[PDB]
Ligand binder design. Structure first.
Ligand SMILES: [Ca+2]
Ligand SMILES: [K+]
Ligand SMILES: [K+]
Ligand SMILES: [K+]
Ligand SMILES: [K+]
Lengths: 103, 105, 103, 105
């Protein structure tokens, strides 16, 4: 149906308009950064291959969680705790962003 | 007791009333599409029984998470990461939607 | 500090005012129901002691997840999938509720 | 590049500006209180090393979840359930807050 495609595209364009918003860009960059850091941290401190460090970081920053791995070192656990709150703060940021975008 | 039932019905009506929104519908189809892709991907690449691939896909895409399985291949891992952001995208989309339907006038 | 206690109490009263809202009551009852059902389902179909069925239901309906148990039977898995979406729908319900409560 | 930095700072200022809200503060203290209680509870009742009790408490209260540990006692289980709803309460509270600070005027 054309109605369907048209609606989808209207929405896609709306999503694209966001990647053009400075504040949204910031939020985006910060999480990308946060993802890099985490990848690096768990790679060195917890000794996980980069890909498994990125995975754990993602799955953790998004609250999906890893059904197998858990930080072994104490330093790892502390970092993971603060890491998670950064994620909570990051998502509220987007939430607030969207809540404002309508008005 | 009666107001409970009456309120429930009014709300239950609304949920359906929103099931008529063109944008809600697309989000729904996109989610179902995402769910189907995941199911295929994981049964294929991770060799998971189809029902296990759909299950992993659902719990992964909703941030619930699987307490036992994790992709074993680097391929599955990469896909899961992006898959999760799709999910995050889908949910914000719904949230944005609800946000608009509230602050309407 | 008195300022602190006063603010807290103002907020507690606000939370209490909600338990007096019919629509909120509904949302509440539905999840309680949903929790009962789940407890029963996983108890019989997956053979978990009621307490472990309630736990799995809660941890699953709230997206916390169980780091050990996963449904073994196919019927269990299908139910868990629909169960989770009920939860997503239930939480959006509260979300919408709150988003309206301000205006 | 400069607008990035300038925007970041303006936003970074706001987060702090909100750290001055009396209601945000209480929510924060309540969360810290909840976190401390959990840490005590789990090290005591579940015999978890203090840092493991705080960790389990954080991942549990944020719906992230622990991929390896689960309370072993029926006592720990009951507590975890309520604990999770406290967390759900805390988050809605913050959300409600953000909701109000947006739709202000
Ligand atoms: Ca596990
Ligand atoms: K998990
Ligand atoms: K979650
Ligand atoms: K969430
Ligand atoms: K989770």
């Amino acid at each position: 149906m054309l109605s369907f495609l048209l609606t989808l595209k209207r929405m896609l364009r709306a999503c694209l308009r966001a990647w053009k918003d400075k504040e949204f860009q910031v939020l985006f960059v910060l999480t990308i950064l946060t993802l890099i850091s985490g990848t690096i941290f768990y790679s060195t401190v917890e000794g996980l291959r980069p890909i498994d460090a990125l995975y754990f970081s993602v799955v953790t920053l998004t609250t999906v969680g890893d059904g197998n791995f858990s930080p072994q070192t104490d330093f790892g656990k502390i970092f993971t705790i603060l890491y998670i709150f950064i994620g909570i703060g990051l998502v509220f940021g987007f939430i607030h962003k969207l809540a404002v975008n309508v008005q």
